[PDB]
Every structure is written in C-alpha cells, then in structure tokens.
Design an enzyme around this catalytic site. Sequence first.
Site, PDB file in Angstrom:
ATOM      1  N   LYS A 277       0.708  -1.141  -0.025  1.00 42.57           N
ATOM      2  CA  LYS A 277      -0.041   0.044  -0.111  1.00 42.57           C
ATOM      3  C   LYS A 277       0.901   1.134  -0.006  1.00 42.57           C
ATOM      4  O   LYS A 277       1.626   1.383   0.925  1.00 42.57           O
ATOM      5  CB  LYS A 277      -0.803   0.090   1.345  1.00 42.57           C
TER       6      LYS A 277
HETATM    7  C1  LIG Z   1      -6.739   0.427   2.979  1.00 43.17           C
HETATM    8  C2  LIG Z   1      -7.360   0.799   1.605  1.00 43.17           C
HETATM    9  O1  LIG Z   1      -7.238  -0.595   0.734  1.00 43.17           O
HETATM   10  C3  LIG Z   1      -7.731   0.667   4.091  1.00 43.17           C
HETATM   11  O2  LIG Z   1      -7.025  -0.013   5.198  1.00 43.17           O
HETATM   12  C4  LIG Z   1      -8.041   2.169   4.260  1.00 43.17           C
HETATM   13  O3  LIG Z   1      -7.102   2.911   4.932  1.00 43.17           O
HETATM   14  C5  LIG Z   1      -9.316   2.337   5.199  1.00 43.17           C
HETATM   15  O4  LIG Z   1     -10.300   2.010   4.613  1.00 43.17           O
HETATM   16  C6  LIG Z   1      -9.547   3.788   5.537  1.00 43.17           C
HETATM   17  O5  LIG Z   1     -10.987   3.912   6.319  1.00 43.17           O
HETATM   18  P1  LIG Z   1     -11.161   5.124   7.269  1.00 43.17           P
HETATM   19  O6  LIG Z   1     -11.317   6.036   6.074  1.00 43.17           O
HETATM   20  O7  LIG Z   1     -12.627   4.786   7.779  1.00 43.17           O
HETATM   21  O8  LIG Z   1     -10.117   5.122   8.219  1.00 43.17           O
END
Ligand SMILES: *C(CO)[C@@H](O)[C@H](O)[C@H](O)COP(=O)(O)O
Lengths: 316, 316
Positions: free
Chosen positions: B131
């Site tokens: 990521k």
């Molecule tokens: C990674 C995306 O592939 C996830 O872990 C994102 O960081 C989260 O979905 C972010 O969610 P919030 O906006 O609720 O913190």
Amino acid sequence: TDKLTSLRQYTTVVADTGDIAAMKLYQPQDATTNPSLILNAAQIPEYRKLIDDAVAWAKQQSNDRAQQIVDATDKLAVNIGLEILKLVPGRISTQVDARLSYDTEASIAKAKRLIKLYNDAGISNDRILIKLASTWQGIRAAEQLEKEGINCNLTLLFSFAQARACAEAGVFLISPFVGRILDWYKANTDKKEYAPAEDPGVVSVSEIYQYYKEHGYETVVMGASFRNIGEILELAGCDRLTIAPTLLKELAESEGAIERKLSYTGEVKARPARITESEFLWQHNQDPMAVDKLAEGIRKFAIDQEKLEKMIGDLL
Amino acid sequence: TDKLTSLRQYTTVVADTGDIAAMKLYQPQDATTNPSLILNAAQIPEYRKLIDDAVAWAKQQSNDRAQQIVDATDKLAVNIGLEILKLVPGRISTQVDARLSYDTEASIAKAKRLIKLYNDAGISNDRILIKLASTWQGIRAAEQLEKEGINCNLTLLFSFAQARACAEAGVFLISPFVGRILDWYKANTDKKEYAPAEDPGVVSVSEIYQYYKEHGYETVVMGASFRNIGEILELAGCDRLTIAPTLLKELAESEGAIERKLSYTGEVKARPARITESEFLWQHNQDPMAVDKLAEGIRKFAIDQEKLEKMIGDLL
Ligand SMILES: *C(CO)[C@@H](O)[C@H](O)[C@H](O)COP(=O)(O)O
Ligand SMILES: *C(CO)[C@@H](O)[C@H](O)[C@H](O)COP(=O)(O)O
C-alpha cells in the site's frame, strides 16, 4: 504625525493595488499587482485606454485568436505596470498566469515573455519583479530566472518549507502572507479573535524574518495580505510590507508613533544542506493551513485570469 | 438470506482490519491493513506474541537502537499479515511508512524490504499488495515496483487526477476512498446529509469505475473507507470493496437481496496521452477536498507510525 510616516522609518512601504490614484496619494517605493487586482483595475473607466492599447497591440502581433487573447491579457497587465512605473521610483510586481504554477518550464517561458514586453517598452529588469507562486515548481522557475538576470517575487508563501526553499534558491524577494493565514485560523480553529502579537500570520512572518537574517540570506522579506492595521504594526521593521489603499488610508489617518518590532541582532549561523524536493513536500504538507491556502490562492488567481480572458475575448 | 451474501454475488468482499477474528467470521477473499489498524491490532492481547517475535527478530538483525525500532515495526506489520494470510485465500495489503509518501526511492526501498520479509517467511508476491499513498511520488514508486513483479494498492485516492495517473501507471489496484470524502463534505458545505446515490464519495468511486472500464484499464477498483451500509450497497458491482467488521456485521444481519448498481456496458474508448506531472499537480489541486484529505491521511498515518515506534521503543 501619523502611523504611516512612523512605519516608513522602519519598513519600505509598497502599495498593493493596480490603481494609479493610490500611487499619487501615498507615494510608495514599489507597487504589487496580481491577477485579481489586474481584473479589478480593468473596471476603472480611465483604464479603458490601456485595454484598448493592449487589444490593438495584440492584433498587430498575430492573426490567431487564441494568441491574441493571451497577448492582450499579458500586454494589459504590463500596460498597467508601465503606468505605475511612471509614479513609483522602485519596482512593479507582475504575476505570471497562475495556470502555470505547477509547470517550471512554462513559468520560466511566461516570465521571459513578460520581461520582454517590459524591455520592449523601454523598461529594464531592475524595475520589475515577476511574481510566481511558491510551489516547488515556481521556486525552481525562480532559481533559474534569477540566474538569467530576472528578479522574482515569490508569492502565496505559507509554510516554513516554502520559506526555506525560496531562501536556498536565492530568490530576490518573498511575499509571506499574513491575512490569509488569519482567515484560515478563524475558519478552522475554536479561536476566532487574536491579539496582534498572537496573530498566526504575524507569527509566521516574524519567524521567517528571523530565520532569514540569522542565516544571512539576502532575499527581501515583504509581508503581504493584511486584514487590519494591528497586523501591519506588529511587523514594523520588516524589509518591506505591501499594503492595500484601505489600510494605507487607515495608517495615514492614525496619530502617533510606533515602535520597531521586527529585528535581528545576533550572530550569522551556518546554513544547513539544501532542502530536497521530498523533504520540502513532506514539510509543506505537514502544515494543513499551507496546503489548503497555497492551492486555493492558485485556484482563485487562475479564475481571475480566465475572467480577464473572457473580458478581452469579448473585445476582439 | 442476507445483504452480505447478496453483495458477494457482484463484488469481491475484503475485510478492512488487522483482527483475525473478523477473518474467521466473515471469510473475506482479501484483507487490508494500514498503520492505524496495525496500531489498534497491537493492542489485542493474543497479538503480544507477534510483537515479541518482531522485537526479538529486530534485535537479531542489528545492534543499533534506531534500526531496531524500524525493523521491529516492519516485522510486526508483516507478522500480522502472515496471521491473516493463514485465514484468507487471497491478498493482504500492508502499507509502507507514510513518512515516505513524497519520496519515490525510499518508498521503493521500503516496499522491497517488506516484500523480502514476506518472501523470507515463504509467502510469494501474488499474496501481497504493498500500500502506497497516491502522491505523484507513490504512483511513480508503484509503476516501478509493478515492473519488478511487486503488486501495489494505491491508497488515499481522492482526485480524478490521482485515479487517471494510477491507471496510466498500470498499478495492480486502487483504493478510492468514500467515507473520508463524505467527511469532508459534511465539514465544508451546508449539506450535512446525503442520499446514497448523492454521496460524493459514492459519486467519485462510480465515476472512476466508469472511466477505468470505458478505457479497458485492468487496475482493480476497490472502494475503501465507509461510514454506512448505504454507501456500500450503492457500489455493489465494484470489483472489490474493503469493509470494516462493524459494517460487515450490519450487512450480514440485514435481510434481503440487493441489486447490482455499478456496471459498464458500452464500447472500449481510445486512451489519451499520459498525464504529465504538471498536468497532474494542476488537476489534483483543482480539487480542494482531495488536496486537504490526501495530505491529512498521510499526516495521520505517520502519527500512527510514530505511536507504533514509541510502543516498540518502550519494549527494547
Ligand atoms: C486500505 C485501503 O485499501 C484501508 O485500510 C483504508 O486505509 C481504510 O479503509 C480507511 O478507512 P477510514 O477512512 O474509515 O479510516
Ligand atoms: C502580491 C504579493 O507580493 C500581492 O498583490 C498579494 O496577492 C495580495 O497582497 C494578497 O492580498 P489578499 O490576501 O487580500 O488577496
């Protein structure tokens, strides 16, 4: 006597307007324009002759419509600068198209285009500052322009990263903003009113001034963007301050003498290694205010450039 | 039956958590973590053994304290990924240090470091997504990593510029955010409540999906960040969706069948020239929401990385 006269003891006063009446009245050393001020100045009826000169000159330079619009807006901004140069002994600041703020090469090219227009009207480079937004790309544009004998005014300066990068690039002058910083703090924190010494715009310019002098940088520090005379007076001693006619009027009509506030007395310190682009990007985006306002000022100045093109477009 | 089962007909469901209990319970295809989720997972008592392994492994890699902290946090994030991979058949997403978001080379290096740690534990690259924040720099990191056989998940994606740049870089997957977009609109406009089809996060993902399919790009579109099941159901048909356990629970307990919402039926169109860095910077900063939230998510993820280092620091 008055606070405006007291301030000029400490600070070179610059007029933030495209209106010549203000130059006759306050007799500033330099003047600054930007695209919003150019747009507003174009509404002054006595300036119709300058729009007419610009449109006529453009039609003489080419037979292409797109290029005529571009030429006319550039020539209009310069015509206004030329009128102002008749009335101020020092510099005029003229801003490049804000749509070029993230493109170093296009910005360098546009800066040169404007410098040529001034040169072709008989004005040499020591009367001009080309205004560029303080993005990494604008700062790189400026570093190169300074090497080619074109002096720059680095504007929309909000973050310390921006201030450090401009110093290290050897730019002629920076325009750290005060009022827009205050605007942001009002809109984004609980605290909606500030004593002048606590005004976060004032704190920002003060800290930049200190850093510049303590490392012996020769870049001129010019505070810009003001919401009240309290901000201006807390910055007395800044190399320059560019001030709208409204606040010039207020200073000129306030009685009393003011103290110098901004000074550096100590030893010249050793400079660090130059900030790299990654370090700069990291430190700039640490400052949520600077993130928002740099981008916003660029958007607004571009909208005003489009409006200027619409207006010129209707006259071809 | 239930809305979660109905959704899986149309969309691959991914669990947004570092908690293995959720994997046992909902049996998702893939899982995503990020540094906040890694920080929260480290508080789970059953995960103390994973912190202990990470700290012990770090001490085996070097005798320098700074390097041990870095090594332990990396190994901890991987150890969590390894536990999750025992329970999901597909991929784990593991995020690089957000302090590296504006440094392409450091990001590439860190990505490789994490890939090595997984490989050393017997896991091949087709089980992993690294990521990275969707800055220009992260997108350039990803383009290169993809060429070296490392698949990436481009996160904190808010602007169309970001979506276009990621497609053109050939990244494996994007994580366009929904809920944080909604968060911004609440905090910065008059309108504080939105029908699911009007939710600006839902509109953003829908428009990105369309653009990707209409140009035949093979980058996986995975909506992420959710505030309510309405947002998720309006996006049924998205290639993937990553969903926190709270909302998985709500879907699983909600009766009924849902209809597919997101589809592209038309013809594959010709791609444009690649967006350049200047065009990208210009178009990204046209979107005030994207400007604010990209920078903010990076700041917050970095704070959580620091907290993770403080915690590990106390155990050496
Ligand atoms: C990674 C995306 O592939 C996830 O872990 C994102 O960081 C989260 O979905 C972010 O969610 P919030 O906006 O609720 O913190
Ligand atoms: C140029 C800076 O050297 C100036 O023309 C600035 O754009 C203005 O001072 C900005 O003032 P506002 O914040 O009131 O627009």
